[PDB]
Amino acid sequence: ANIETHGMVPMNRLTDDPRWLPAMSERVTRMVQRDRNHPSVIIWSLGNESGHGANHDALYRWIKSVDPSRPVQYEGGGADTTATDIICPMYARVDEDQPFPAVPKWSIKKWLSLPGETRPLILCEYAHAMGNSLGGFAKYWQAFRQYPRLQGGFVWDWVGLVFADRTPHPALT
Amino acid sequence: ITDSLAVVLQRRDWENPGVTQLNRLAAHPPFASWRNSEEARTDRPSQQLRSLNGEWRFAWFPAPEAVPESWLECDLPEADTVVVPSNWQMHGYDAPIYTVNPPFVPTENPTGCYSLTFNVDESWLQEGQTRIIFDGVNSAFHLWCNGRWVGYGQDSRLPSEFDLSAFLRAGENRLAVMVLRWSDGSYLEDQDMWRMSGIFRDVSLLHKPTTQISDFHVATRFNDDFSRAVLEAEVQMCGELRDYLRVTVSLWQGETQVASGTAPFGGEIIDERGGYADRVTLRLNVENPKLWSAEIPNLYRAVVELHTADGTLIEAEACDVGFREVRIENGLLLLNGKPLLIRGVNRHEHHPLHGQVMDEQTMVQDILLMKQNNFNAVRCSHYPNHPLWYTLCDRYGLYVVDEANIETHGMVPMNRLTDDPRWLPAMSERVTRMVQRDRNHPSVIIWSLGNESGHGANHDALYRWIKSVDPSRPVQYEGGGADTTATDIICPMYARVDEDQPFPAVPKWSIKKWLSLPGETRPLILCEYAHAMGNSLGGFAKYWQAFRQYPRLQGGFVWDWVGLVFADRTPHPALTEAKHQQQFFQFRLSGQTIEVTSEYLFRHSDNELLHWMVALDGKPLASGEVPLDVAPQGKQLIELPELPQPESAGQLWLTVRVVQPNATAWSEAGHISAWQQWRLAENLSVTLPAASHAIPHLTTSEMDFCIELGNKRWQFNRQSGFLSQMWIGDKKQLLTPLRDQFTRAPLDNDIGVSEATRIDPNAWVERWKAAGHYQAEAALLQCTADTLADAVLITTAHAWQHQGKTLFISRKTYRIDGSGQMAITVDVEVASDTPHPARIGLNCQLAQVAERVNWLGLGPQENYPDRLTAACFDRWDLPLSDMYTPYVFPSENGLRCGTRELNYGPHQWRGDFQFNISRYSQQQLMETSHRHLLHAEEGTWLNIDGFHMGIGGDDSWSPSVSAEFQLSAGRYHYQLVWCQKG
């Protein structure tokens, strides 16, 4: 869904405000009504980098009621809130923890085994490919193979892994 | 008659799994039968409990049928005298054994016939019940009293009690105990230790009144914040029920009573037919109770008095009560609301010189040593322990896992008996009688169903029995994959931190992966890990890094306390590594600020002092002491003063240590509990050496190169290509030429289970032998000598070939300058297809024997690439004897890593190397079976390695050296400087 408010100073200033719920509901509902018939679409996403507000929980439950055939994921508020069926951290590391206040980025191996955690983990963003990059990519895929509940991820910026003229980067190999 | 041996032994009760006892009394907590409340409160000795330990008569027989009938009446003429708490194998009768027909035992069953003549006062026989308690008898036994058969028993590790009232006569009496070595119970006690047999625990006589306390157990309930507690005690009596009988339970903290309760008999309504007339439950309210933990073992004294309504006491029983709550919440094992981190060790009952007989002094010595090494938990390794062990763990503070005596690892399906309902009665007795005995001890926090018996339906049934009877403790069981339905805790044996071991039907996942398997929510505590056999415990820091990071990884139990110490309780070098990794204070350095985090859950750091020191290459520069004021799990930030900034070359090292100024019950004043070291600042050396005016002189012959400088002189063998001799004055310095070494005397981890019969091709030592590393012969490729403007240059190249295959190539450079110094640069190529060598360095036999070894490097104790975290960089001076570790089976030992300078006699070696120095060569260590056969050689053997392979430790039967500690680079370089006192 076309919801992205990363510039807000609390970052949930609008997604926790009920006055913005009508605006955000239109962006979620009209997407589902348009694309619900496509077999390729297997997961709904509530947006990107908008904190976690009560509007996210309400819109998460709307999708589950209208279309129970697809899981709903959302990074925001720590990537493991009640508004996501999948733990989907951004740029979580394989072994090193990043305990930021109120939104820690645990290592993906440790994140799975936290007390009470049963959901699968798929990284919505990992392996930043800006410039000469993608070092340690083999570390992620060693972990993906070994751990059943580590079910892959999405490399950031296809185009990126290729130039604008679609010429490939060395990291694409 | 029917008391005769022929009748008694005819039914073969020791070959019947359905008969485990005959005429044995019910299990219960320990009883002393005090006739005075004050004596019970203060735990004074009771005159109603009499010990029969002492001198008994003993006779040995090859089989039970060989015992003559006359033994039942009179002591044999050839019977000798022994101290009854002993194993008869320790007296040399049949050979002790360290190592099938499931119900049957061999007909050649050695039999020990014990007999004792004792006196009984008439006061015991006129009134009351007199019983005899056998705390431990190995396998099975038959009991006679004055020639009359009494009963039969099994389950060596739990007390057997029999009523002797109808058998005792006023005056002199005689007891006859027929102990058999093997019974059907031996199939459930088929573990791996010295087998041994006899009456290995205490024998005592207890006199109880006609109306007596038959059983009692206590339960503690708490509110949300543990500010209010309820102590419920259920008391059961035996004998005649009278309406004037009363039971009083009083709780004492020291000498002040804090709670009390009195009630007549008659319990609450249980079901339709009513309630127990012989039971009463007393509820005692305690405000702000002092909680029990391993850190602070706060104990109360509960006194249970059976008395008349008027006020006359009949009998008194007492026990120590600790207030604590153990439960698993959200996949975490909590004690008093806090997540436990188990610093545990497995401990067998092994006396230093009396075999399996345990005494109080050895137990207190073991507990003190454990707590001084930051251990907080002990696993009762595969059987219930001596009763006094649990009392001592309550008082000093140690979490205890109590294990049922069930062990059937020798069965081919390994669950052949535990899945057989015909063996359920046998196994139930071993579980139920343990719980009935030890359920009142606060130190016991976890029940264990046994060890290495597969997983059968009997395990599930016995697991649910414990949960019903005692819901206050979790139940754990390894077996059937360590995560079955019969365990509340995933308790794998020797699971690795990162590497998975997917065995069929019982995989050993890595502990990190095991936690996150689909549907898995339980905590993980390793019942056995870090095998400490020989030179071992490599990679121990890997486990404790994982323990800290993952909340549901709550520690484990290191295998074999005694092991981590020798039989005489002398510590192994690996014990220091365990103490450092198990510290309760963690340290972080950021600039001039030291962050100290407390790992205690309950206590405040009120006996703690931080001493910091800054040294430059072992030379102290500044020091200071700061008191520690850290809340449980809190952080204290300690800002160091302006640290010294020397302009001399070298590395600055900051060392902190936690010192306890006051003595505790388990430690003496000045005890060091934690330490840490850092590198502060290094000034690289840029100064040139002094312009020596002299030049070493080179002479060339067809057999050798000779370099002469003053009184010193070097000789290089041109045929061998190695430095053969060095002379200071006219005194030779070497007995063996300085040559490259690529092998080490194999460790126990290097050997594995590779016997001479069942070879293990995957073992490290077998791969080295198959590759010819021990048989490779050095071949000289080139050897040249050139005179420089100020030095003499020697260049050599050797190839180590085995059966037409080059394993290693060594290119060495010798630079003898005019100052007398000798610089040695070594470049080594290792073939990629050969197994990685155990070491890359040099060795020689020095002619001189010296008393002290002085080196600037890591640790006073021996350390290895994967067991060096506990070691510290400083200047160490030790006698040569302390440079050798006396392992029972000789192997490579005594290595010191991270060494920059080594001094021995007049010789100094500088560089970046590891070394071991001793009087035994690596060749002798490989060929000598036991350390008592080791003999010192003529000189001193020195091994200087640029690189050394890590030691194993995850297990002892499979390769366990991690990839980052294997010598797999392929090409290696190191430099050494050899100088003298000039």
mmCIF file of N, CA and C in Angstrom, chain A residues 27-100:
data_model
loop_
_atom_site.group_PDB
_atom_site.id
_atom_site.type_symbol
_atom_site.label_atom_id
_atom_site.label_comp_id
_atom_site.label_asym_id
_atom_site.label_seq_id
_atom_site.Cartn_x
_atom_site.Cartn_y
_atom_site.Cartn_z
ATOM 1 N N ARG A 27 -6.089 4.002 0.803
ATOM 2 C CA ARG A 27 -4.904 3.503 0.114
ATOM 3 C C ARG A 27 -4.774 1.989 0.226
ATOM 4 N N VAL A 28 -5.287 1.398 1.302
ATOM 5 C CA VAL A 28 -5.180 -0.042 1.507
ATOM 6 C C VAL A 28 -6.322 -0.761 0.799
ATOM 7 N N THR A 29 -7.550 -0.271 0.980
ATOM 8 C CA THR A 29 -8.717 -0.985 0.465
ATOM 9 C C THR A 29 -8.751 -0.980 -1.060
ATOM 10 N N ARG A 30 -8.432 0.159 -1.678
ATOM 11 C CA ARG A 30 -8.499 0.241 -3.132
ATOM 12 C C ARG A 30 -7.395 -0.560 -3.810
ATOM 13 N N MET A 31 -6.285 -0.819 -3.117
ATOM 14 C CA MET A 31 -5.267 -1.709 -3.663
ATOM 15 C C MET A 31 -5.742 -3.156 -3.649
ATOM 16 N N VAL A 32 -6.343 -3.584 -2.539
ATOM 17 C CA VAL A 32 -6.823 -4.958 -2.424
ATOM 18 C C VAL A 32 -7.940 -5.214 -3.428
ATOM 19 N N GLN A 33 -8.845 -4.246 -3.585
ATOM 20 C CA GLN A 33 -9.953 -4.410 -4.520
ATOM 21 C C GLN A 33 -9.471 -4.515 -5.961
ATOM 22 N N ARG A 34 -8.298 -3.959 -6.265
ATOM 23 C CA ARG A 34 -7.807 -3.978 -7.637
ATOM 24 C C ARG A 34 -7.042 -5.259 -7.958
ATOM 25 N N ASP A 35 -6.210 -5.737 -7.031
ATOM 26 C CA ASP A 35 -5.214 -6.758 -7.337
ATOM 27 C C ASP A 35 -5.479 -8.106 -6.677
ATOM 28 N N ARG A 36 -6.646 -8.308 -6.066
ATOM 29 C CA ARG A 36 -6.884 -9.536 -5.316
ATOM 30 C C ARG A 36 -7.020 -10.774 -6.195
ATOM 31 N N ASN A 37 -7.158 -10.621 -7.510
ATOM 32 C CA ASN A 37 -7.344 -11.764 -8.392
ATOM 33 C C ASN A 37 -6.047 -12.294 -8.987
ATOM 34 N N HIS A 38 -4.917 -11.654 -8.718
ATOM 35 C CA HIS A 38 -3.660 -12.065 -9.326
ATOM 36 C C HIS A 38 -3.033 -13.201 -8.529
ATOM 37 N N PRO A 39 -2.765 -14.357 -9.143
ATOM 38 C CA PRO A 39 -2.098 -15.439 -8.399
ATOM 39 C C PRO A 39 -0.691 -15.090 -7.944
ATOM 40 N N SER A 40 0.019 -14.220 -8.668
ATOM 41 C CA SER A 40 1.393 -13.898 -8.296
ATOM 42 C C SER A 40 1.463 -13.152 -6.971
ATOM 43 N N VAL A 41 0.446 -12.357 -6.650
ATOM 44 C CA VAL A 41 0.418 -11.639 -5.381
ATOM 45 C C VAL A 41 0.128 -12.650 -4.277
ATOM 46 N N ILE A 42 1.109 -12.887 -3.412
ATOM 47 C CA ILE A 42 0.960 -13.852 -2.333
ATOM 48 C C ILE A 42 0.967 -13.203 -0.956
ATOM 49 N N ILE A 43 1.428 -11.962 -0.831
ATOM 50 C CA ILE A 43 1.503 -11.271 0.450
ATOM 51 C C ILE A 43 1.059 -9.827 0.259
ATOM 52 N N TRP A 44 0.246 -9.333 1.190
ATOM 53 C CA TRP A 44 -0.075 -7.915 1.270
ATOM 54 C C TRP A 44 0.892 -7.219 2.220
ATOM 55 N N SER A 45 1.254 -5.985 1.886
ATOM 56 C CA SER A 45 2.086 -5.149 2.741
ATOM 57 C C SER A 45 1.333 -3.868 3.067
ATOM 58 N N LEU A 46 1.324 -3.495 4.348
ATOM 59 C CA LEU A 46 0.572 -2.335 4.811
ATOM 60 C C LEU A 46 1.254 -1.009 4.503
ATOM 61 N N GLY A 47 2.486 -1.024 4.025
ATOM 62 C CA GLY A 47 3.203 0.191 3.727
ATOM 63 C C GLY A 47 4.657 0.051 4.109
ATOM 64 N N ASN A 48 5.287 1.185 4.405
ATOM 65 C CA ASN A 48 6.714 1.204 4.691
ATOM 66 C C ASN A 48 7.050 2.377 5.598
ATOM 67 N N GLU A 49 7.827 2.104 6.644
ATOM 68 C CA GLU A 49 8.458 3.119 7.488
ATOM 69 C C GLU A 49 7.462 4.188 7.941
ATOM 70 N N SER A 50 6.420 3.735 8.639
ATOM 71 C CA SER A 50 5.404 4.635 9.169
ATOM 72 C C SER A 50 5.164 4.401 10.655
ATOM 73 N N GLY A 51 6.152 3.864 11.367
ATOM 74 C CA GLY A 51 5.962 3.541 12.765
ATOM 75 C C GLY A 51 4.928 2.442 12.935
ATOM 76 N N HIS A 52 4.298 2.429 14.105
ATOM 77 C CA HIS A 52 3.179 1.534 14.365
ATOM 78 C C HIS A 52 2.109 2.306 15.117
ATOM 79 N N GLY A 53 0.939 2.454 14.496
ATOM 80 C CA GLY A 53 -0.195 3.090 15.129
ATOM 81 C C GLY A 53 -1.400 2.167 15.139
ATOM 82 N N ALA A 54 -2.467 2.653 15.774
ATOM 83 C CA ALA A 54 -3.707 1.888 15.823
ATOM 84 C C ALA A 54 -4.334 1.747 14.443
ATOM 85 N N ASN A 55 -4.059 2.689 13.539
ATOM 86 C CA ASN A 55 -4.578 2.584 12.179
ATOM 87 C C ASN A 55 -4.011 1.363 11.467
ATOM 88 N N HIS A 56 -2.748 1.024 11.742
ATOM 89 C CA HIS A 56 -2.154 -0.171 11.150
ATOM 90 C C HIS A 56 -2.877 -1.432 11.601
ATOM 91 N N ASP A 57 -3.203 -1.521 12.892
ATOM 92 C CA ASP A 57 -3.908 -2.695 13.395
ATOM 93 C C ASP A 57 -5.298 -2.808 12.783
ATOM 94 N N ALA A 58 -6.010 -1.685 12.670
ATOM 95 C CA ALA A 58 -7.342 -1.709 12.078
ATOM 96 C C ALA A 58 -7.292 -2.132 10.616
ATOM 97 N N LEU A 59 -6.323 -1.614 9.860
ATOM 98 C CA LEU A 59 -6.231 -1.954 8.445
ATOM 99 C C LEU A 59 -5.710 -3.372 8.246
ATOM 100 N N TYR A 60 -4.883 -3.860 9.171
ATOM 101 C CA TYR A 60 -4.444 -5.251 9.113
ATOM 102 C C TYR A 60 -5.626 -6.202 9.245
ATOM 103 N N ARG A 61 -6.518 -5.928 10.199
ATOM 104 C CA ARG A 61 -7.669 -6.795 10.418
ATOM 105 C C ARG A 61 -8.682 -6.689 9.282
ATOM 106 N N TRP A 62 -8.756 -5.535 8.614
ATOM 107 C CA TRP A 62 -9.643 -5.410 7.461
ATOM 108 C C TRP A 62 -9.223 -6.353 6.340
ATOM 109 N N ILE A 63 -7.921 -6.423 6.059
ATOM 110 C CA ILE A 63 -7.435 -7.303 5.001
ATOM 111 C C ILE A 63 -7.688 -8.762 5.359
ATOM 112 N N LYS A 64 -7.432 -9.135 6.615
ATOM 113 C CA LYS A 64 -7.659 -10.512 7.040
ATOM 114 C C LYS A 64 -9.122 -10.905 6.874
ATOM 115 N N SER A 65 -10.042 -9.972 7.125
ATOM 116 C CA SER A 65 -11.459 -10.267 6.952
ATOM 117 C C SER A 65 -11.835 -10.352 5.477
ATOM 118 N N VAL A 66 -11.365 -9.401 4.671
ATOM 119 C CA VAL A 66 -11.784 -9.341 3.273
ATOM 120 C C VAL A 66 -11.115 -10.441 2.458
ATOM 121 N N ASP A 67 -9.804 -10.621 2.622
ATOM 122 C CA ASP A 67 -9.048 -11.617 1.866
ATOM 123 C C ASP A 67 -8.202 -12.447 2.821
ATOM 124 N N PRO A 68 -8.757 -13.531 3.366
ATOM 125 C CA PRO A 68 -7.970 -14.418 4.231
ATOM 126 C C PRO A 68 -7.019 -15.341 3.484
ATOM 127 N N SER A 69 -6.948 -15.260 2.156
ATOM 128 C CA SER A 69 -6.103 -16.163 1.387
ATOM 129 C C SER A 69 -4.647 -15.718 1.316
ATOM 130 N N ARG A 70 -4.319 -14.514 1.781
ATOM 131 C CA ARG A 70 -2.943 -14.051 1.746
ATOM 132 C C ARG A 70 -2.514 -13.552 3.119
ATOM 133 N N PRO A 71 -1.269 -13.807 3.511
ATOM 134 C CA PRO A 71 -0.739 -13.197 4.733
ATOM 135 C C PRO A 71 -0.514 -11.703 4.557
ATOM 136 N N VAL A 72 -0.528 -10.997 5.683
ATOM 137 C CA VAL A 72 -0.293 -9.559 5.728
ATOM 138 C C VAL A 72 0.993 -9.311 6.502
ATOM 139 N N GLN A 73 1.900 -8.546 5.906
ATOM 140 C CA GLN A 73 3.168 -8.203 6.528
ATOM 141 C C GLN A 73 3.296 -6.690 6.630
ATOM 142 N N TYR A 74 4.051 -6.240 7.629
ATOM 143 C CA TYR A 74 4.316 -4.815 7.794
ATOM 144 C C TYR A 74 5.553 -4.633 8.655
ATOM 145 N N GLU A 75 6.564 -3.962 8.115
ATOM 146 C CA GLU A 75 7.684 -3.488 8.912
ATOM 147 C C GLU A 75 7.350 -2.111 9.467
ATOM 148 N N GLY A 76 7.625 -1.918 10.748
ATOM 149 C CA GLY A 76 7.284 -0.670 11.398
ATOM 150 C C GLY A 76 6.911 -0.895 12.843
ATOM 151 N N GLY A 77 7.498 -0.113 13.742
ATOM 152 C CA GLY A 77 7.334 -0.392 15.151
ATOM 153 C C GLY A 77 8.116 -1.588 15.640
ATOM 154 N N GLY A 78 9.181 -1.966 14.939
ATOM 155 C CA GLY A 78 10.010 -3.082 15.337
ATOM 156 C C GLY A 78 9.872 -4.340 14.507
ATOM 157 N N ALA A 79 9.090 -4.313 13.429
ATOM 158 C CA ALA A 79 8.945 -5.384 12.446
ATOM 159 C C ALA A 79 8.338 -6.661 13.014
ATOM 160 N N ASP A 80 7.889 -6.664 14.269
ATOM 161 C CA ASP A 80 7.266 -7.842 14.859
ATOM 162 C C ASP A 80 6.029 -7.469 15.665
ATOM 163 N N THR A 81 5.319 -6.428 15.245
ATOM 164 C CA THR A 81 4.135 -5.963 15.952
ATOM 165 C C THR A 81 2.971 -6.916 15.690
ATOM 166 N N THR A 82 1.797 -6.550 16.198
ATOM 167 C CA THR A 82 0.586 -7.328 15.981
ATOM 168 C C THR A 82 -0.030 -7.093 14.607
ATOM 169 N N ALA A 83 0.498 -6.150 13.829
ATOM 170 C CA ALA A 83 -0.024 -5.830 12.510
ATOM 171 C C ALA A 83 0.708 -6.568 11.393
ATOM 172 N N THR A 84 1.487 -7.592 11.727
ATOM 173 C CA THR A 84 2.210 -8.367 10.729
ATOM 174 C C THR A 84 2.127 -9.849 11.069
ATOM 175 N N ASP A 85 1.925 -10.672 10.042
ATOM 176 C CA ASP A 85 1.981 -12.120 10.191
ATOM 177 C C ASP A 85 3.389 -12.671 10.026
ATOM 178 N N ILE A 86 4.324 -11.857 9.551
ATOM 179 C CA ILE A 86 5.688 -12.278 9.265
ATOM 180 C C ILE A 86 6.636 -11.259 9.877
ATOM 181 N N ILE A 87 7.616 -11.739 10.638
ATOM 182 C CA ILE A 87 8.685 -10.864 11.102
ATOM 183 C C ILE A 87 9.508 -10.443 9.895
ATOM 184 N N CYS A 88 9.485 -9.152 9.582
ATOM 185 C CA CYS A 88 10.078 -8.630 8.353
ATOM 186 C C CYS A 88 10.995 -7.455 8.668
ATOM 187 N N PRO A 89 12.122 -7.706 9.332
ATOM 188 C CA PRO A 89 13.037 -6.611 9.663
ATOM 189 C C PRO A 89 13.719 -6.041 8.428
ATOM 190 N N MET A 90 14.136 -4.785 8.553
ATOM 191 C CA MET A 90 14.957 -4.123 7.550
ATOM 192 C C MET A 90 16.412 -4.174 7.993
ATOM 193 N N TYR A 91 17.250 -4.824 7.187
ATOM 194 C CA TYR A 91 18.702 -4.818 7.373
ATOM 195 C C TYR A 91 19.109 -5.376 8.734
ATOM 196 N N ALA A 92 18.389 -6.394 9.196
ATOM 197 C CA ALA A 92 18.843 -7.153 10.350
ATOM 198 C C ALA A 92 20.041 -8.011 9.960
ATOM 199 N N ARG A 93 20.992 -8.139 10.876
ATOM 200 C CA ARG A 93 22.220 -8.865 10.598
ATOM 201 C C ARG A 93 22.089 -10.326 11.012
ATOM 202 N N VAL A 94 22.966 -11.161 10.451
ATOM 203 C CA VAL A 94 22.865 -12.602 10.663
ATOM 204 C C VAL A 94 23.169 -12.959 12.114
ATOM 205 N N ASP A 95 24.269 -12.438 12.651
ATOM 206 C CA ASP A 95 24.736 -12.823 13.976
ATOM 207 C C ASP A 95 24.812 -11.677 14.972
ATOM 208 N N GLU A 96 24.984 -10.441 14.515
ATOM 209 C CA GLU A 96 25.176 -9.303 15.403
ATOM 210 C C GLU A 96 23.843 -8.628 15.701
ATOM 211 N N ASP A 97 23.582 -8.384 16.983
ATOM 212 C CA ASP A 97 22.380 -7.686 17.413
ATOM 213 C C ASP A 97 22.604 -6.179 17.409
ATOM 214 N N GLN A 98 21.528 -5.438 17.149
ATOM 215 C CA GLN A 98 21.543 -3.974 17.138
ATOM 216 C C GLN A 98 20.413 -3.483 18.031
ATOM 217 N N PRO A 99 20.617 -3.484 19.350
ATOM 218 C CA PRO A 99 19.525 -3.151 20.291
ATOM 219 C C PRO A 99 19.242 -1.655 20.413
ATOM 220 N N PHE A 100 18.592 -1.110 19.388
ATOM 221 C CA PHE A 100 18.135 0.266 19.449
ATOM 222 C C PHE A 100 16.994 0.394 20.460
#
